[PDB]
């Protein structure tokens, strides 16, 4: 049992067994408690995907910076931004800063980079939960195959 067994017919194929129910469920809600969206193409109709060839060009790095800027002005109190890796988090944040994009995100929210070592990370996580509780709000930009993605 978990919460996100994504196809249920893969786990009896990898693990050599035969279940008897193999069921799925969905939670009931009094509202729409979640609003998933897939923000695809950019604001000037440019594709946004993180392929391996579509990472160097600044028509996509700007469209990631133009997204986190325009979501940090309409979302209250905390945004978690999972990147795909650590060398892509470095090569985008340090390429938002050389442009005029990371200057305008720090006006709205503080940003707390989740680094690999556990000493700086727990410092940057305790200040993140402090910044979401007082007025300013924060952005914890991290890595999807990381410590914060599974534990916190």
């Amino acid at each position: 049992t978990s919460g996100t067994l994504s196809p249920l017919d893969i786990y009896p194929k990898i693990l050599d067994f035969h279940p008897v129910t193999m069921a799925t469920f969905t939670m009931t809600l009094a509202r729409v408690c979640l609003c998933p969206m897939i923000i695809g193409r950019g604001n000037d109709q440019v594709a946004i995907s993180s392929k391996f060839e579509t990472r160097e060009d600044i028509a996509v790095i700007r469209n990631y910076g133009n997204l986190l800027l325009e979501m940090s002005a309409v979302v209250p109190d905390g945004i978690v931004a999972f990147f795909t890796s650590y060398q892509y988090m470095e090569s985008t944040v340090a390429s938002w800063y050389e442009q005029g994009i990371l200057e305008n995100i720090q006006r709205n929210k503080l940003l707390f980079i989740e680094t690999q070592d556990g000493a700086e990370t727990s410092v940057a996580l305790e200040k993140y939960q402090e910044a979401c509780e007082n007025g300013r709000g924060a952005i914890l930009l991290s890595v999807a195959r990381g410590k914060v993605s599974e534990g916190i």
Binding site: V75, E133, G135
Partner: protein, 280 residues
Amino acid sequence: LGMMRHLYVVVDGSRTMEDQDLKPNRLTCTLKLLEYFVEEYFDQNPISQIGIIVTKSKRAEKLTELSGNPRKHITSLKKAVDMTCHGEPSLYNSLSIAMQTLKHMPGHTSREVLIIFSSLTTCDPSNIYDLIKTLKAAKIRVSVIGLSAEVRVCTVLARETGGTYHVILDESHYKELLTHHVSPPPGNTEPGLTLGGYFCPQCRAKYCELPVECKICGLTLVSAPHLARSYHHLFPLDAFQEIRFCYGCQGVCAVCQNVFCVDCDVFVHDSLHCCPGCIH
């Protein structure tokens, strides 16, 4: 019935006040309904007060001092349509400015702050959570009207100090939220009645046609008919038992024993508020 009130109105002046989704200027649609709000506040509450604070670029600047002047507020909100509104607001600097004056009011009143708040971020140089222990000690009642989202401070600032937090659906909901902030929640002052045109008895100073306080000697000058409308709520008239020739219109009271018709019976309790036989 109600009590005296010393309401402050904190108006947001951030970058996000240039936003759409409202009448031409988000700031302008705020100041439009505030001028409606000052009128209905002073009408139902005769001897109360209004201050108006505007927060802008990490600093709070007092737009109008705390006085019961129902003309000086509206003539200052018309000026502030052409405000710049640059930078990020504050909430420590704006609630402290609304605490250096509102703390020293006498304890028989209902001191209140009302924050109209459009930005999401309060960049302020200290901890907000020590004000909410201070404002709760000074019996202030801070209530926020939020725009476009729900912030965690504005929930814990409201529910700890004692006010309400509310977020706007649209402009028909924004007028409905400001309308609920005119009813007072359930001492002896000394005002000066301003007979003879409009002159002050204490300092004999002649000024404008106003229910305002007197600057030369500090006395408050109210008009006694305006105080008179708040009567008849206390000791109102008891209804009659009803089982031709009338006494009101001349074409049954348990006090004066004079019969009424049906038009007269509804008229006595609705508008006249006295029994026409009992005044004799």
